[PDB]
Amino acid sequence: MSAIKPDMKIKLRMEGNVNGHHFVIDGDGTGKPFEGKQSMDLEVKEGGPLPFAFDILTTAFNRVFAKYPDNIQDYFKQSFPKGYSWERSLTFEDGGICNARNDITMEGDTFYNKVRFYGTNFPANGPVMQKKTLKWEPSTEKMYVRDGVLTGDVETALLLEGNAHYRCDFRTTYKAKEKGVKLPGAHFVDHCIEILSHDKDYNKVKLYEHAVAHSGLP
């Protein structure tokens, strides 16, 4: 039936640079692709303690972990075993900009993730470089096709200390490695990403995400 098992492993390395600060971060986790649920342990291996809010990274740490109903084409599960890639722009309300990419493959029971994350133009006094973020709010990703490429848009925000939000707009493009994987119709994916636990300087983080695809109806 499926290259994708009900329980899968996740292995990840991210390398990147934010405002000139270099880092390498590993991840090891598990998830339930058909339930839309994943968790992982992250550990900063180089560049810790990170001089910027860990939260900006967390959506870069795989839409295979989204619960798809039968009446929406599941591009991500159909991309396996060969896998798929994504590229994402993040634009923050104070001029901070990030570009991230993940190349996702599958070896047996495990998704492998080659993640890159680059950010620049964050103000030194802003909540990212001052580490004032608390969490991402739950969000809805709008999926559609633009110029033949599956595209997801998110308009979201980070909650900050002090009853304030910090707006970010995401655009992600998604591409199957196999030629011929059919594009889906437009739809939504509801997301909620959470840091479940952390150590003092976020050198160790446990991250969870729940995602469900839907058409806007009950």
Q: How many residues does the chain have?
A: 218
CB contact set of 146 (below 8 Å; sequence gap of 6+): none
What are the residues facing 87 on neighbouring strands?
101, 173
Its domain, for residue 70, covers: 1-218
CB contact set of 178 (below 8 Å; sequence gap of 6+): 79, 82
Please count the structural domains in the chain.
1
- Residue 25 tokens, joined: 């971060």
- Residue in 140, 128, 118 with CA at minimum distance from that of residue 55: 128
Buried b (16+ CB within 10 A) or exposed e, 12-45: bebbbebbeeebebebebbbbbbebbbbbbbebe
